[PDB]
């Protein structure tokens, strides 16, 4: 079980191309393509990532391998984010991935909003951090995606996704 995998679950995997909300090409899962309102643009994009003319359609494999760039950068940004940083520093790398999950979802700002959570998660105060995590909105607005997210911190294990 991987980042990967729990995504599709959570999020879901789009093989063609399509807008997101603000209006953006996207592809795989939550790939951003190109700002540009060009479909063209976006397809030139795609083609150059994977290495081979797709007319705007992808593999499994070729959306993993998306998927994969976009983890290092969601990493990338966390380990800048002062707030999120000495979290992550302290996780174990199952409970990692949770943390990017909710990256994922709602960005950096979103999490580094859940304050008594990050606290909690920083001093392995597993119970206390799902407690608090299950009375955000954001359970209230995805409660089967949270539920796993927050098992997942709970337990430090891949159970929930089995």
Same mark, same amino acid.
């Given at each position: &079980?991987?980042?990967?995998? &729990?995504?599709?679950? #959570?999020?879901?995997?789009?093989?063609?191309?399509?807008? #997101?909300?603000?209006?953006?090409?996207?592809?795989?899962?939550?790939?951003?393509?190109?700002?540009?309102?060009?479909?063209?643009?976006?397809?030139?994009?795609?083609?150059?990532?994977?290495? $081979?003319?797709?007319?705007?359609?992808?593999?499994?494999?070729?959306?993993?391998?998306?998927?994969?760039? #976009?983890? #290092?950068?969601?990493? $990338?940004?966390?380990?800048?984010?002062?707030?999120?940083?000495?979290?992550?520093?302290?996780?174990?790398?199952? $409970?990692?991935?949770?943390?990017?999950? &909710?990256?994922?979802? &709602?960005?950096?700002?979103?999490?580094?909003?859940?304050?008594?959570?990050?606290?909690?998660?920083?001093?392995?105060?597993?119970?206390?951090?799902?407690?608090?995590?299950?009375?955000?909105?954001?359970?209230?607005?995805?409660?089967?995606?949270?539920?796993?997210?927050?098992?997942?911190?709970?337990?430090?294990?891949?159970?929930?996704?089995?």
């Amino acid at each position: &079980m991987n980042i990967f995998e &729990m995504l599709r679950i #959570d999020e879901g995997l789009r093989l063609e191309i399509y807008k #997101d909300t603000e209006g953006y090409y996207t592809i795989g899962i939550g790939h951003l393509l190109t700002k540009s309102p060009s479909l063209n643009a976006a397809k030139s994009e795609l083609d150059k990532a994977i290495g $081979r003319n797709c007319n705007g359609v992808i593999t499994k494999d070729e959306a993993e391998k998306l998927f994969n760039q #976009d983890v #290092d950068a969601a990493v $990338r940004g966390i380990l800048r984010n002062a707030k999120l940083k000495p979290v992550y520093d302290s996780l174990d790398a199952v $409970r990692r991935c949770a943390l990017i999950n &909710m990256v994922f979802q &709602m960005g950096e700002t979103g999490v580094a909003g859940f304050t008594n959570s990050l606290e909690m998660l920083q001093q392995k105060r597993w119970d206390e951090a799902a407690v608090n995590l299950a009375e955000s909105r954001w359970y209230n607005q995805t409660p089967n995606r949270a539920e796993r997210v927050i098992t997942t911190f709970r337990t430090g294990t891949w159970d929930a996704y089995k």
